[PDB]
Symmetry: C3
């Protein structure tokens, strides 16, 4: 509403898959940095049943204006269709860090 | 003001977190709850510096369901005033956002 | 957005540093609470190689009003010139928790 930069969260099934997508996304300079956490548990339902995946969390720091491309790359590379993939607004931070994200970006 | 929220919260151990996540998703109040591995919280209680081990939770949900998610989690939580904070979702993969929406009846 | 309170994400090169900065933050009463997670893997470019460091993740919960001092403190204690340090807006939560945050920052 509308922020210059975005914090994206996702998960991969797997930490090798997370790594592949991560590095792709950094080589291409679509994201300045991707963080891959240690395994999380996701509880959801499908669709009358309560489900329990063991997953790998990813945080993507980026420019909003690069969002559609990142979405496309990540989701294309992800084994599921309909992966967790959500964005929250970056609303401030250390200026020179914020500017690095911006400078690194292929705009 | 967003259609959807990312909620951060903390439980004292994995067992209480998992049984709160299950409730919240059985109740169709959250589409998905993520439980992380343990996490060190540092905070001041007696004007003294404390260190609890906790498990972190992320809840993806519709803003409209927030009051119920709040109460559910807070009543079930052992602490009087636990950590519970809302963050805006302002984008994502459409079919994923849609699956969150579809999944609350309201 | 212009929120009362922020969620800040940041990162330290190891847990001892995270602890040291956490402690400072909490004993200065700049942040009511600070969360140090278990290691994460950060992927980013430097000198146009693809790097991955293991890092310790931090969440800071605070009043937007304290922000300038938190940034100042965290950035200067951090060993890198340009640490990861971003804020996202808190737009809601358990009233008495947000209060507690509000009350723990001396006025």
């Amino acid at each position: 509403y509308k922020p210059e930069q975005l914090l994206i969260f996702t998960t991969c099934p797997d930490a090798d898959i997370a790594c592949r997508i991560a590095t792709a996304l950094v080589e291409a300079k679509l994201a300045a940095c991707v963080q891959i956490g240690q395994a999380v548990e996701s509880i959801y339902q499908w669709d009358n049943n309560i489900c329990q995946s063991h997953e790998v969390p990813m945080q993507i720091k980026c420019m909003t204006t690069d969002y559609p491309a990142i979405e496309q790359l990540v989701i294309t590379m992800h084994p599921y269709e309909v992966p967790e993939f959500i964005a929250t607004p970056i609303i401030g931070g250390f200026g020179p860090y914020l500017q690095w994200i911006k400078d690194n970006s292929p705009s």
